[PDB]
Design an enzyme around this catalytic site. Structure first.
Site, short mmCIF file in Angstrom:
data_model
loop_
_atom_site.label_atom_id
_atom_site.label_comp_id
_atom_site.label_asym_id
_atom_site.label_seq_id
_atom_site.Cartn_x
_atom_site.Cartn_y
_atom_site.Cartn_z
N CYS A 87 4.76 0.70 11.30
CA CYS A 87 3.76 1.41 10.38
C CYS A 87 4.37 3.15 9.56
O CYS A 87 4.59 3.42 9.57
CB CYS A 87 2.10 1.62 10.78
SG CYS A 87 1.12 2.71 9.88
N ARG A 136 1.50 5.62 9.26
CA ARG A 136 1.77 7.34 9.56
C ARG A 136 1.02 8.12 8.92
O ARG A 136 0.58 9.38 10.22
CB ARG A 136 2.66 6.89 11.28
CG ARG A 136 2.74 5.77 11.50
CD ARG A 136 3.51 5.59 12.74
NE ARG A 136 4.90 5.32 12.59
CZ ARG A 136 6.39 5.49 13.15
NH1 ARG A 136 6.14 5.77 14.15
NH2 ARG A 136 6.75 4.74 12.05
N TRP A 138 -5.70 1.47 4.60
CA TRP A 138 -5.80 0.68 3.21
C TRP A 138 -4.92 0.20 2.73
O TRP A 138 -3.78 0.84 3.36
CB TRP A 138 -6.02 1.60 2.03
CG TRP A 138 -5.60 3.08 2.51
CD1 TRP A 138 -4.13 2.89 1.88
CD2 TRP A 138 -6.28 4.86 2.85
NE1 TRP A 138 -3.38 4.23 2.35
CE2 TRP A 138 -5.12 5.69 2.85
CE3 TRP A 138 -6.96 4.89 3.56
CZ2 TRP A 138 -4.95 6.49 3.65
CZ3 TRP A 138 -7.14 6.58 3.56
CH2 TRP A 138 -6.05 6.53 4.08
N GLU A 144 1.91 -5.57 -0.29
CA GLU A 144 0.94 -6.51 0.92
C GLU A 144 0.46 -7.32 0.50
O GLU A 144 0.86 -9.03 0.69
CB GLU A 144 -0.04 -5.50 1.92
CG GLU A 144 0.88 -4.47 2.98
CD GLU A 144 -0.17 -3.73 3.42
OE1 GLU A 144 0.09 -4.59 4.56
OE2 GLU A 144 -0.03 -2.62 2.98
#
Ligand code: HEM
Ligand code: HEM
Ligand SMILES: Cc1cc(N)nc2cc(CNCCc3ccc(C#N)cc3)ccc12
Ligand SMILES: Cc1cc(N)nc2cc(CNCCc3ccc(C#N)cc3)ccc12
Ligand SMILES: C[C@H](O)[C@H](O)[C@H]1CNc2nc(N)[nH]c(=O)c2N1
Ligand SMILES: C[C@H](O)[C@H](O)[C@H]1CNc2nc(N)[nH]c(=O)c2N1
Ligand SMILES: [Zn+2]
EC number: 1.14.13.39
Lengths: 405, 404
Positions: free
Chosen positions: B108, B111, B280, B285
């Site tokens: 991630c 974070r 979000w 992506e």
């Protein structure tokens, strides 16, 4: 099923098993608990014998005479040599087999579909810093071939017990100078500050361009390094221009046509070649993205971005991205114009796919370092991004080594 | 010794000694590195020893280790495990676990946000029917009219000798992929299997490129029931390019909430097979992977043709050029519609501070280098030049087999 690494390509859904890694008898940086795969640099007659034996074996296998009396005589000949001199010598065509293997075994090289076509120059006779320069000049002339580049390598004497190593001090045969400025900045390539200073200490009279080719600092065994300057005609360069932005040519940007590493140890059968420079040709993102746009290099991104009229005020304009693409397009189009061998990141990674597919059938695997194989721009846009990879140390290998000083 | 971690853009060096707390194994050994593999290859006081740790983690977190409340809680857990072979977490412990599981997920980039997570306890769920209600609420809260908010909903733990609560879908929102007999595929190729699973459980399929799929929810040991999301929960953004007029004509569009249904939450030894979480989007992506990946919507060439680029040869960098225009349109559209989103540059910058905070609080941060670096413009972002150490900390979000 199989007790080997499963390897998946997610673009295509295809699966492979790496059976070659079972031959890797050097431990890398990872363990069950922690993965250090992103790290750039992690860190006896007895011992030699077993490596030597393994290389001769690789060799005879490579020419399908494994277990033959040719093979088992060579082996005996080597133990005989290690017995009396504490070392052994290679044969020409052994050497050539190893130099191509270390290339082929090199995980960070997207260019390996070419590993077969490598001109190997035997310089194991070379006896002086003077003569090194002569060999090196020959190489540059050959590999450059007027912009029709030819991969090559030149091998100087191996490390001998208790005697100085042949060493070349520069990291590459061609390197722009790095001049520590009075205000604190650096003029030219900041990567090359330390070597630039060292040439100076050793007698170089230094210019003050952004693009001043350094002299070489060649060291013969047990002798102070000697300074040699390259003849400007021997060092082909490409002036960078852009195919539609006419102002880009005005930025005065240049890169040299020949990437030639000269500071890496070449290891074969346990024999260490501390001077053994090799050359290929560039993949366009090496120049356009890392060398020209890296924060800690020429750092020309904001500059191009501003000429482009971009919104360098905010990240979300992607001003950095637009700039880096056009700079890369410029490296490509310039080298093409100049008739100098160059390959873009798309075409290079496509060829590496074919290489992997080749080595699958040939060895049952290909050691690969994903982070270094995926282009530093448009990652997801190249096939190798979607390709899982196993990484391990095979020998013969090209290794990193302490700077002589 | 302990790993030496360097930033090759700044010259700084750190030391990850938090890795010394990993007790799960990764895919690597010293002879081979398998860091680039997307998935892995697949008695009772082991449980206790995972629980004793987590409880210590929790009480050390709120500044109260060794204390009474700690001592008792340790024995509570011990006793419940000794007598039932399992135990349960109090809600505040759960909320802590869930936040650590976000903090420890090495893949991630987001974070920096890990403390600001809404935890919905949904362990009093006893049916597909209830599952759907809890999910409908997750979405409205998390979506928050486009001012998005990080949330997790935790459904009942797995239990020995009983099936699992499962959400069959990979995400709460996904687009249907219909394999047309012509080899080709309408919609999102990544979603073909689940689309058909949906159809076969009596879903009435559409035939659009962006058909919002229904949810297959499965309460323990029963067949999955099929629920349809109320369209006014699925917030979508139409894509349009801030300077290219023709781009909006492409009929492209992407939903706003990235929520993952199929992963498993592990806390103190307990496993939650249904515990969807959302945040979000980062623009890449949508712009790079979902729209340009060859095995996804793959619009790279079309756009490039519309840009009047040179498809003929790779060296005109048309692929690169089109991609950047796409990522821009996704950043444009989302920012125009006031739907929370972040560009890959902004994102990795914050992650670098996060790396720094983490280094100061715990002595490290588990990062999957290949997942942290964005899918375009790798070296153009500061995370590219940062060495990372990877390892499995618990609490942890894990992968788990599809329920079929
Ligand atoms: C012929 C065309 C070639 C291409 C396009 C190519 C491409 C590349 C690229 C793009 C890299 C990564 C560079 C970086 O970012 O630092 C690399 C690394 C490497 N290449 Fe190749 N290469 C070629 C030829 C060769 C040859 C002839 C050899 C050896 C004889 C070789 C050996 C290596 C090694 C050992 C590395 C790792 C660099 C390191 O460890 O620092 N390559 N290559
Ligand atoms: C708030 C904004 C957030 C952003 C911008 C963000 C960004 C990302 C990105 C870019 C990835 C890579 C995934 C991919 O490439 O497919 C990722 C993965 C991941 N993130 Fe985040 N995230 C956010 C919130 C969260 C939250 C709320 C959680 C959990 C509570 C979380 C935990 C994870 C996990 C477990 C993965 C691994 C996914 C997988 O393995 O499929 N993140 N995140
Ligand atoms: C044959 C070759 C061909 C080619 N096209 N490009 C090539 C690039 C290289 C570049 N390797 C250097 C990358 C590096 C490694 C370590 C450190 C440190 N410390 C700093 C930089 C080497 C050989 C190449
Ligand atoms: C919280 C979260 C936030 C965000 N912005 N994006 C997020 C994206 C994901 C996407 N992860 C899916 C990646 C994947 C993993 C495994 C397999 C397989 N097999 C195929 C694809 C998950 C969570 C996210
Ligand atoms: C820290 C990280 O390993 C470092 O930036 C790597 C990333 N990938 C790379 N890839 C290539 N080809 N060359 C490099 O120098 C690097 N550098
Ligand atoms: C094979 C390769 O590791 C795989 O495609 C990875 C690479 N890096 C990634 N990085 C992110 N953020 N998301 C991904 O899905 C992937 N996929
Ligand atoms: Zn590893």
């Amino acid at each position: 099923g199989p007790k080997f690494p499963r390897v998946k390509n997610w673009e295509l859904g295809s699966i492979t098993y790496d059976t070659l890694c079972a031959q890797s008898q050097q431990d890398g940086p990872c363990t069950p608990r922690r993965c250090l795969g992103s790290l750039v640099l992690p860190r006896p007659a007895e011992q030699l014998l077993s490596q030597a034996r393994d290389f001769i074996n690789q060799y005879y296998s490579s020419i399908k005479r494994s277990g033959s009396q040719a093979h088992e005589e060579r082996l005996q000949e080597v133990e005989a040599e290690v017995a009396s001199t504490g070392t052994y010598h290679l044969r020409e065509s052994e050497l050539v087999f190893g130099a191509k293997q270390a290339w082929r075994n090199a995980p960070r090289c997207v260019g390996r579909i070419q590993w077969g076509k490598l001109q190997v120059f035997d310089a194991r006779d070379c006896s002086s810093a003077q003569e090194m320069f002569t060999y090196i000049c020959n190489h540059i002339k050959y590999a450059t071939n007027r912009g029709n580049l030819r991969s090559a390598i030149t091998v100087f004497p191996q490390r001998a017990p208790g005697r100085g190593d042949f060493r070349i001090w520069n990291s590459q045969l061609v390197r722009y100078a790095g001049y520590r400025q009075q205000d604190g900045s650096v003029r030219g390539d900041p990567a090359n500050v330390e070597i630039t200073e060292l040439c100076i200490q050793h007698g170089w009279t230094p210019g003050n361009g952004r693009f001043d080719v350094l002299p070489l600092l060649l060291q013969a065994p047990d002798e102070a390094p000697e300074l040699f300057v390259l003849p400007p005609e021997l060092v082909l360069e490409v002036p960078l221009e852009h195919p539609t932005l006419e102002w880009f040519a005005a930025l005065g940007l240049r890169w040299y046509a020949l990437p030639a590493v000269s500071n890496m140890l070449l290891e074969i059968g346990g024999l260490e070649f501390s001077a053994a420079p090799f050359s290929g040709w560039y993949m366009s993102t090496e120049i356009g993205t890392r060398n020209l746009c890296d924060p800690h290099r020429y750092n020309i991104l904001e500059d191009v971005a501003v000429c482009m009229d971009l919104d360098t005020r905010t990240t979300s304009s992607l001003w950095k991205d637009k700039a880096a693409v056009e700079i890369n397009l410029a490296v490509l189009h310039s080298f093409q114009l100049a008739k100098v061998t160059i390959v873009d990141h798309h075409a290079a990674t496509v060829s590496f796919m074919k290489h992997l597919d080749n080595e699958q059938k040939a060895r049952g695997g290909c050691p690969a370092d994903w982070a270094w194989i995926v282009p530093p721009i448009s990652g997801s846009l190249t096939p190798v991004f979607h390709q899982e990879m196993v990484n391990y140390i095979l020998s013969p290998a090209f290794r990193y080594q302490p700077d002589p000083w």
